[PDB]
Design a binder for this molecule. Sequence first.
Ligand SMILES: Cc1cc2nc3c(=O)[nH]c(=O)nc-3n(C[C@H](O)[C@H](O)[C@H](O)COP(=O)(O)OP(=O)(O)OC[C@H]3O[C@@H](n4cnc5c(N)ncnc54)[C@H](O)[C@@H]3O)c2cc1C
Length: 451
Amino acid sequence: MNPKRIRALKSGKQGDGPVVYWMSRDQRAEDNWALLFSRAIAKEANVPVVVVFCLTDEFLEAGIRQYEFMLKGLQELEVSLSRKKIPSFFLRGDPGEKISRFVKDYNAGTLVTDFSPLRIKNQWIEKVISGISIPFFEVDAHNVVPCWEASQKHEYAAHTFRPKLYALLPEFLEEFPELEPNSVTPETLSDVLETGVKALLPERALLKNKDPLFEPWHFEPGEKAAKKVMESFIADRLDSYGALRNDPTKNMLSNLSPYLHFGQISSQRVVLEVEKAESNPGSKKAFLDEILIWKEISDNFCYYNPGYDGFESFPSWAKESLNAHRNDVRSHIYTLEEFEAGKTHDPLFNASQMELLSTGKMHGYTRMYWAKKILEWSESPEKALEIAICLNDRYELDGRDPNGYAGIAWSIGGVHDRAWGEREVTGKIRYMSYEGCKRKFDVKLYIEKYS
Ligand SMILES: Cc1cc2nc3c(=O)[nH]c(=O)nc-3n(C[C@H](O)[C@H](O)[C@H](O)COP(=O)(O)OP(=O)(O)OC[C@H]3O[C@@H](n4cnc5c(N)ncnc54)[C@H](O)[C@@H]3O)c2cc1C
């Protein structure tokens, strides 16, 4: 139990009641350092640990697709926590009011949360801090190396983050102890879900048909399903991962991101299991570079760049280049709605958007293509960011995520990239031509599937 995984958010005066884990990003009972640390604090204080989760007011900014995925996972999590004699409380409202009142009503001794560098989580933390008098910690349960330990600063390139992260893997890549049950046992989510779906229904994504776009059978939610997705990746897809990760016609990615986003599975767990797997070495190297380096550099980016969703966080070479080309005439301009409906003149863009609409998980390779075309066919880089973020967060099951803001910033602003050949409109931002994709994979086949 490495104390570098835990950080103080606010000093206070310990109470004598239960330890409260305010669960937010890591919605799982296994392999969860935030829950493990909370249990350990509780054991030392001779009190139970309890879990609280806030069903916030912001759910109406995404769709049923994410809400159902999350809540069905939480239904399973209730069962799992209760088998460990750990009660769970689902508070309807936003954390400032609800966590502060829970702490008071339940005489909590200590408050622990998990770690997210996103602005909304920090907004919540500030409001909670002002409503409590007990000590308040956070634990990095999402990264193998705690974000504030991996580097002291924003890293401008994967090649400067990678050696720092790997220098720390021998220390921090380690097995998880079993979660000790509590010593004794100290509105349903279904009804919550029904109420939420009712509120979301008018904005559900539909065909002109009125038939719903989303297909909810591609990724079944919850901890158990996540483990099966991990196991089938290692058994059936990891060998081919190195060769096929950039081919969106093949179903050869891990498909773990929706689970990783909600923390229904630990990336540290996935890494442990992949490390021990015997597969082609280039495949393992490639996969670990995505789930370790690119995933954790995305937390690095959001943690150290308050303006991570804005033009100002782009590297200076990219800001200067995009500025130099700000007044270039765009070959096309599309509205948010035209992008959203897949109604551009580019059939590969449209098919990428259709994959997002129907499955909630656009292939990683075409996400790069897609965001770069939003840059190319919008009035400014600032507008491009807004559109890409809006669509990514509204329709990706894995959205509203540091990987999203960092991936969009990479695509549009060259964050964690270098200058390439100068073009009009897009300046030196890496370009991803349609023709280049055709040389790379069977574009026609991808278009046929998603049209
Ligand atoms: C414009 C754009 C937007 C993106 N938005 C998101 C988002 O909202 N949420 C999200 O989780 N990922 C996002 N990504 C990163 C990446 O596209 C997805 O993580 C990946 O496609 C998810 O599929 P998978 O789990 O099957 O991937 P795999 O290839 O199996 O990768 C395994 C895991 O590694 C991590 N990973 C892989 N690629 C990246 C990457 N480029 N950056 C960061 N972490 C990575 C993810 O945790 C992923 O689940 C975005 C990328 C771009 C270019």
